[PDB]
Amino acid sequence: GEEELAEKAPEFARELAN
């Protein structure tokens, strides 16, 4: 359940920083 988020990782790094 962590691969899908790592393979796609949609604007996750930014949303996570904004």
Curated annotation (Swiss-Prot):
A divalent metal cation binds at residues 3, 7, 11, 15. The record marks 10 as: Important for activity (Pro and hydroxyPro). The lineage of its organism: Eukaryota, Metazoa, Spiralia, Lophotrochozoa, Mollusca. Changing residue 15 to K: No change in activity. It comes from Conus rolani (Cone snail). It comes from the Eukaryota. The chain holds residues 79 to 96 of 96 of the full protein. It is found in: Secreted. The record marks 8 as: Important for selectivity. Hydroxylation of Pro-10 is important for NR2B/GRIN2B NMDA receptor selectivity. Removal of hydroxylation does not change global NMDA receptor antagonism (tested on WT neurons), but it decreases the inhibitory potency on NR2B/GRIN2B NMDA receptors and increases the inhibitory potency on NR2A/GRIN2A NMDA receptors. Hydroxylation of Pro-10 locally disrupts a small region of the divalent cation-induced alpha-helix but does not destabilize the entire helix. Expressed by the venom duct. The mature peptide does not contain cysteine residue. Residues 1-18 have a biased composition (Basic and acidic residues). The modification 4-hydroxyproline is found at residue 10. The modification 4-carboxyglutamate is found at residues 3-4, 7, 11, 15. The modification Asparagine amide is found at residue 18. Conantokins inhibit N-methyl-D-aspartate (NMDA) receptors. This toxin has antagonist activity on the NR2B/GRIN2B subunit (IC(50)=0.1 uM). In vivo, when delivered into the brain, is active has anticonvulsant activity in the model of epilepsy in mice. Disulfide bonds: none annotated. This is Conantokin Rl-B. Belongs to the conotoxin B superfamily.
